[PDB]
């Protein structure tokens, strides 16, 4: 296999926004390790002239999720949202950064 181009580690929320604001297409995203919740992950996505942030939650069994559907890994959560919108307000499909 090859590594994933979307894991940025501990990049500040502000820097994620600065980086994603420069992206060409809506849906461009990255997964970052939260600085507010040690051990927690956040999903940053470009949409128009904004950058939306989604908190990656974990249920009682340790599965990850954003809304209702649960995933056994960040990898599956990410791939799922390439075909299903991450947003409740508009259609936003995840696309790898350029």
């Amino acid at each position: 296999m090859k590594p994933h181009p979307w894991f940025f580690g501990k990049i500040p929320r502000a820097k994620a926004e600065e980086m994603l604001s420069k992206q060409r297409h809506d849906g461009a995203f990255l997964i970052r390790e939260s600085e507010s919740a040690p051990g927690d992950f956040s999903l940053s996505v470009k949409f128009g002239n904004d950058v939306q942030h989604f908190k990656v939650l974990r249920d009682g069994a340790g599965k990850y999720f954003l809304w209702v559907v649960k995933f056994n890994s960040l990898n599956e959560l990410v791939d799922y949202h390439r075909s299903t919108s991450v947003s409740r307000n508009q259609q936003i499909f995840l696309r790898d950064i350029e």
Partner: peptide
Amino acid sequence: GYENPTY
């Protein structure tokens, strides 16, 4: 904050 309610 985040787009998805966190609690």
